[PDB]
């Protein structure tokens, strides 16, 4: 939640999506915990999705 809030805030400060490198120095995480946080999977796509 903190990561998404900071990313939402930085979206309208610079006008485009903020890269992990920037999110690392906008918070105190050391630039690789951000990758592993972003890597957490999204809710499983349902196996009945019409293709």
């Amino acid at each position: 939640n903190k990561l998404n809030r900071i990313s939402r805030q930085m979206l309208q400060e610079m006008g485009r999506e903020p890269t992990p490198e920037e999110l690392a120095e906008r918070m105190l995480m050391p630039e690789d915990k951000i990758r592993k946080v972003l890597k957490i999977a999204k809710e499983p796509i349902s196996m009945e999705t019409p293709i």
Binding site: R8, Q12, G15, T19
Partner: protein, 1340 residues
């Protein structure tokens, strides 16, 4: 006079009717719509301005804070189109809005604010549209397809005497708004009026009238006419209106003024009514029995006791009349009702209806809409008032209000978008009138009752949805928390809006990949009129009424272009000249016809106004003024054809091809084809693959040049001039001086597109068709695209055809092809694939792109460089390694026997698993391009550095070259300026150019020219540097890939498939057929000059199918190639230019009264030779669609060569040398090559991968799947006695998990025997049934 791209090869035209309206720009729909979307509209009615004005300003929860909108501004894209396609990102522009926040004060309901603040807030990126009407959404080109939905308004449908035993007709109205609940008004077999809001449970129709605050007297006053009564001391004399006496029989002595007019028993005649009107009779005397059934009209209270004598709407009887006799009332109002003209529908509905006043009616509507919860006094009112009469939740809006006002015959065409009492009352009145007999129902397929949405409208609606969700979020944030002197950035979120608009553009039923395997296929995909999609009828629930072709499609929607199959008639295609009205309805041109003269002024008539007039036919003769040469002309007036007079006509069609679409107006001799065959031809003409050397249509229509130029494939010049340098990948036009702006030194630079892939894996590649130092004019063609040729669309090749049965190798529909067709490489097409190899970041460690792959030999790794990526130009085959990738591995728990083997031979298994990308089996191409994308934390390998260096060097060279051409032109213009006004014929060329910009001038407008050119040069000088730094940053920077992927490598193979048995070919007239053999040259039939025929079709395909188009095309093509061969013979020996002039003029003067005078005495004796050189392969011929070249002209043309008039020559046999009896047809037919290639269809599987839950094989040819042994095949095998084949076909081959491996071992042991077991899908079924409460088990 002809343009210089038309003095090269000018197509002979056979049409006779002079055209008066040139074909409009074929892509006006998409371009105009999206231009209306993203556009500053000061009076905001359409565009982002409409959305912003509609949803803003946002007011807090009475918190004295409002967020109000000011303006907006589309930024500019970070990447242009080509870089968006290469990198794989959308092509969009950042939307930026100026929002203003106010905070009010206290003791001030509308008083001044205490502080304001305006801030430019970014909200979303909207994908822009390219120059051709296609969006680039994720690297790919999407096309948003228009929609054909039912127009908002009021529609008085009917029932057509179904759904009931007696066959009564039950009329019903409906009010379809643009946004909001529906509202019907249906009758029922008892003639009671019923209303059902939102297609819900039914209600008596006076409930809504009572909800609108009408008592019973007011309803009866609105819907009825009073028949007064009087009591003139006796005898009940009644006020009379003569007209009402019709349709009834006199039940008493109708007398007045002391004269008997009509007696009892005799019916009332029309002349009796005229007599009554003439006698001026107002009041008559009627018996008391006449009020036995007359419904009262208003409440009567006895003034003595103050008691309700009789409530309104209650039948008077003798007892009631006696009771109210002495009551002191002498006036009695009743209702005038008949059985045919004024039915008592509202009175009966009032009797059925169980309500009594406003509150109970509102409670009844509440219980209908929201059942279960107990109604309240305020909740019911709020529900009804927010149903229809609230602008937040109901809009008609403008087309809806126009249709509504017009359908009720109202004067105005603009009003409030919400309903009102008068609108509902008028709908009820019109429905009652329709029931009474006057008026007609509205058919809901009339093209005047179906709008057309486009990209602008749908994208605007989706953006409005995004805005309203942001509005809810803001209004939540505005109320709570604090005041607080915040800013209007933290209050707004940009992910919802961008999510909504991107979800529309990227995933919808109407936003589909542009099939890009033609110019014609693109230009007929952008002009589609779908009926499906959101807000439109589904495929399953559309009847046969809308699948059909209506008489209103004449000039608006094509009749013979619709995809046959499941949705035939739902995917209509727009006609050629058809446009779109201001409101959305379709319309088409017509020529205004004055007294007798067919004027050439064009009026566009929508689908409604076309009905009123009488419109002549396109092919009606007129002589030098417009006067129809006949006294009778075949017109069409009320949706039906007929023969009318010469003076009653009002309009005439604008062209003879304005009915058919742009796909079906490229078929020559369409008027001879059938309709089913023309449909099949129009659908198969847009699957043709662009071949290696696209050729020409030898028999065309003249609609080829428009399709090629109007589609974006070719490179059309922008300003006229002289070619200065033409390369295989660049054309540099030097603009004419008169077309040049004062500032620039114009030299346009066109960069061609070379060997990029399309969506269908074909190749699109532009070749320049202009020489060096050759003049061009505005709008000329400079580079033939994929499958065009000198500006004329060419979808395939024209080859010498013959119609005869040839030893059964063309049995059903097959085709027998000579071997010259594959030796000459004319159907050989180029296909380009893209293969990707992603290097993810697994749990046990990162993967790698190294070239040291375990247990693979050296021949495989010979084609990989040091970094494990294949070279460029390396001819790979199936199974070769393209990118070497190894992933880390676990421990794998190797079996004891393998442990002994390793212990014996000492070999140690590696800890990495080979998972390299390798060429798909079957394909064999040349690698033409490698792209490496690297995440911005990874050390780039050597090959990525080489690619970066190549890209950087190319960009720097490109910008330096641009500045070199532009500087050359700038100094050329400066030198040309220096010749006049300061002439230096020799004082200038000696000094270097760096000082040419700093010389003197005289006091003219020429004074401010050298300074202007010098300053433009300096501007270009710095612009080069800034562009170079921008490009270097965009190149050297890292990429932004998915989360968890380190680097991606993409390799582009370029296959080249030739031709083989199996490949499907077809002509233009819907005569498809699979190639069946490749005959040697010496086995084909040959005429008496030894020339073999290239394709041998089948005669019996013509009569049963009635596509007589192909035979006439064959004869005309034979004539055209005969002219070509005669010119070639006259050109082979260098005869003269006079002989060539005479013959070509005689070839261009045929036949009988054609247009396009082509006088060749104005050609410059050198342009005649170029024309003759371009005609030496056969003179092209144009046959406009329904205007046509008559058979007599084909005979005359065949005689102008030396071919036989009959069209049939005598062909000998290839193998025996003895002639076929009965002369056979030969000639040049234009054959396509559809992309049903055989090597995409052929598939085979012995054993592969099995599905997950039901252990069965997968789907076809992409996952190496097996064919589906469906239900009908199981019945077929049960019909035989084949019980063992069946048992192996559903246990061992497919499903049984142990039987599969035991069968495989038994097969490789040479022992064919099965041990079946039980399928796994049955055990899955057992568990899925047993997992309900149902205990199912196998008891023995």
């Amino acid at each position: 006079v002809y343009s210089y791209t038309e003095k090269k090869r000018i197509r002979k035209d056979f049409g006779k009717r002079p055209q008066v309206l040139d074909v409009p720009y074929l892509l006006s729909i998409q371009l105009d719509s999206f231009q209306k979307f993203i556009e500053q509209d000061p009076e905001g009615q359409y565009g982002l301005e409409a959305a912003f004005r509609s949803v803003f300003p946002i007011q807090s929860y009475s918190g004295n804070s409002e967020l109000q909108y000011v303006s907006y501004r589309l930024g500019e894209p970070v990447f242009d189109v080509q870089e968006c396609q290469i990198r794989g990102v959308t092509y969009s522009a950042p939307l930026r809005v100026k929002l203003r926040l106010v905070i009010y004060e206290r003791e001030a309901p509308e008083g001044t604010v205490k502080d304001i603040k305006e801030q430019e807030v970014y909200m979303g990126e909207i994908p822009l549209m390219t120059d051709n009407g296609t969006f680039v959404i994720n690297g790919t080109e999407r096309v948003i397809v228009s929609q054909l939905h039912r127009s908002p308004g009021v529609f008085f449908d009917s029932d057509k005497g179904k759904t009931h035993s007696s066959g009564k007709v039950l009329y019903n109205a409906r009010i379809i708004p643009y946004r909001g609940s529906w509202l019907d008004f249906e009758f029922d077999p008892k003639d009671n009026l019923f209303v059902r809001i939102d297609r819900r449970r039914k209600l008596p129709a006076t409930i809504i009238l009572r909800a609108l605050n009408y008592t019973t007297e007011q309803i009866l006053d609105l819907f009825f006419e009073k028949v007064i009564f009087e009591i003139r001391d006796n005898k009940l004399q009644m006020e009379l209106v003569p007209e009402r006496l019709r349709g009834e029989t006199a039940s008493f002595d109708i007398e007045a003024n002391g004269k008997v007019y009509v007696e009892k028993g005799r019916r009332i005649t029309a002349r009796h009514i005229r007599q009554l009107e003439k006698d001026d009779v107002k009041l008559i005397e009627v018996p008391v029995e006449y009020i036995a059934g007359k419904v009262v009209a208003k409440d009567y209270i006895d003034e003595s006791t103050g008691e309700l004598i009789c409530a309104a709407n209650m039948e008077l009887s003798l007892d009631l009349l006696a009771k109210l006799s002495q009551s002191g009332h002498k006036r009695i109002e009743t209702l005038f009702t008949n059985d045919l003209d004024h039915g008592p529908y509202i009175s009966e509905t009032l009797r059925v209806d169980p309500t009594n006043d406003r509150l109970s009616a509102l409670v009844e509507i509440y219980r209908m809409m929201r059942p279960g919860e107990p109604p309240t006094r305020e909740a019911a009112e709020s529900l009804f008032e927010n149903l229809f009469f609230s602008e937040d939740r109901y809009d008609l809006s403008a087309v809806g209000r126009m249709k509504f006002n017009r359908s009720l015959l109202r004067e105005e065409i603009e009003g409030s978008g919400i309903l009102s009492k008068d609108d509902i009352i008028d709908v009820m009145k019109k429905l009652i009138d329709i029931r009474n007999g006057k008026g007609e129902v509205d058919d809901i397929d009339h093209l005047g009752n179906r709008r057309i949405r486009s990209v602008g409208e749908m994208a605007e609606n989706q953006f409005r949805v995004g805005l309203v969700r942001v509005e809810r979020a803001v209004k939540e944030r505005l109320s709570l928390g604090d005041l607080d002197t915040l800013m209007p950035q933290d209050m707004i979120n940009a992910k919802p809006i961008s999510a909504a608009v991107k979800e529309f553009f990227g995933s919808s039923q109407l936003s589909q990949f542009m099939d890009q395997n033609n110019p014609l296929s693109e230009i007929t995909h952008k002009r589609r009129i779908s009926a499906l999609g959101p807000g439109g009828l589904t495929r399953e629930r559309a009847g046969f009424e809308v699948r059909d072709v209506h008489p209103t499609h004449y000039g608006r929607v094509c009749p013979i272009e619709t995809p046959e199959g499941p949705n035939i008639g739902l995917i209509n295609s727009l006609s050629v000249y058809a446009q779109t009205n201001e409101y959305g309805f379709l319309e088409t041109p017509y020529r205004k016809v004055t007294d007798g003269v067919v004027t050439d002024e064009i009026h566009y008539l929508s689908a409604i106004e076309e009905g009123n007039y009488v419109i002549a036919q396109a092919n009606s003769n007129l002589d030098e003024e417009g006067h129809f040469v006949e006294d009778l002309v075949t017109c069409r007036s009320k949706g039906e054809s007929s023969l009318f007079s010469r003076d009653q006509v009002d309009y005439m069609d604008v062209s003879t091809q304005q009915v058919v679409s742009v796909g079906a107006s490229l078929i020559p001799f369409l008027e001879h084809d059938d309709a089913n065959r023309a449909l099949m031809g129009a659908n198969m003409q847009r699957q043709a693959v662009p071949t290696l050397r696209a050729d020409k249509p030898l028999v065309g229509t003249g609609m080829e040049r428009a399709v090629a130029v109007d589609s974006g494939v070719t490179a059309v010049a922008k300003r006229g001039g002289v070619v200065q340098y033409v390369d295989a990948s660049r054309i540099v036009i030097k603009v004419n001086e008169d077309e040049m702006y004062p500032g620039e030194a114009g030299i346009d630079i066109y960069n061609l597109t070379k060997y990029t892939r399309s969506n269908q894996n074909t190749c699109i590649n532009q070749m320049p068709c202009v020489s060096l130092g050759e003049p061009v004019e505005r709008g000329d063609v400079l580079a033939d695209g994929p499958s065009t040729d000198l500006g004329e669309l060419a979808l395939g090749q024209n080859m010498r055809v013959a119609f005869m049965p040839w030893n059964g190798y063309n049995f059903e529909d097959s085709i027998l092809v000579s071997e010259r067709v594959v030796q000459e490489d004319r159907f050989t097409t180029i296909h380009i694939q893209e293969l990707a190899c992603v290097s993810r970041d697994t749990k046990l460690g990162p993967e790698e792109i190294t070239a040291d792959i375990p247990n693979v030999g050296e021949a495989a790794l010979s084609k990989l460089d040091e970094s494990g990526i294949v070279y460029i130009g390396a001819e790979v085959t199936g199974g070769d390694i393209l990118v070497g990738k190894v992933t880390p591995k676990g421990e794998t728990q190797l079996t004891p026997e393998e442990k002994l083997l390793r212990a014996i031979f000492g070999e140690k298994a590696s800890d990495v698993k080979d998972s390299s990308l390798r060429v798909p089996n079957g394909v064999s191409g040349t690698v033409i391009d490698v792209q490496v994308f690297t995440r911005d934390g990874v050390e780039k390998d050597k090959r990525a550095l080489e690619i970066e260096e190549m890209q950087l060097k190319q960009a720097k060279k490109d910008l330096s070259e641009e500045l070199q051409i532009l500087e050359a032109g700038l100094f050329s213009r400066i030198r040309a300026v220096l010749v006049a006004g300061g002439v230096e014929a020799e004082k200038l060329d000696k000094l270097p150019r760096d000082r040419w910009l700093e010389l003197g001038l005289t006091d003219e407008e020429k004074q401010n020219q050298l300074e202007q050119l010098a300053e433009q040069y300096d501007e270009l000088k710095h612009e080069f540097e800034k562009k170079l730094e921008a490009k270097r940053r965009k190149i050297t920077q890292g990429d932004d890939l998915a989360p968890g992927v380190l680097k991606i490598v993409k390799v582009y193979l370029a296959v080249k498939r030739r031709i083989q048995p199996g490949d499907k070919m077809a002509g233009r007239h819907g005569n498809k057929g699979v190639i069946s053999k490749i005959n040697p040259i010496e086995d084909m039939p040959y005429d008496e000059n030894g020339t073999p025929v290239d394709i041998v079709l089948n005669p019996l395909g013509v009569p049963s199918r009635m596509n007589i188009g192909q035979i006439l095309e064959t004869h005309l093509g034979m004539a055209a190639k005969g002219i070509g061969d005669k010119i070639n013979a006259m050109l082979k020996q260098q005869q003269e230019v006079a002989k060539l002039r005479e013959f070509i003029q005689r070839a261009y003067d045929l036949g009988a009264d054609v247009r396009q005078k082509v006088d060749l005495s104005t050609f410059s004796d050198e342009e005649v030779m170029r024309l003759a050189e371009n005609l030496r392969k056969g003179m092209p011929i144009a046959t406009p669609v329904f205007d046509g070249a008559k058979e007599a002209e084909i005979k005359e043309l065949l005689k102008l060569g030396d071919l036989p008039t009959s069209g049939q020559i005598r062909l000998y046999d290839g193998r025996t040398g003895e002639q076929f009896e009965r002369p056979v047809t030969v000639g040049y037919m234009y054959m396509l090559k559809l992309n049903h290639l055989v090597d995409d269809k052929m598939h085979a599987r012995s054993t592969g991968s099995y599905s997950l839950v039901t252990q069965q094989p997968l789907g076809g040819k992409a996952q190496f799947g097996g064919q589906r042994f469906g239900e009908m095949e199981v019945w077929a095998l049960e019909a035989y006695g084949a019980a063992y084949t069946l048992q192996e076909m559903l246990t061992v081959k497919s499903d049984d998990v142990n039987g599969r491996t035991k069968m495989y071992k038994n097969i490789v042991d040479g022992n064919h025997q099965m041990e079946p077991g039980m399928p796994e899908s049955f055990n899955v079924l057992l568990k899925e049934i047993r997992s309900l409460g149902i205990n199912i088990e196998l008891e023995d």
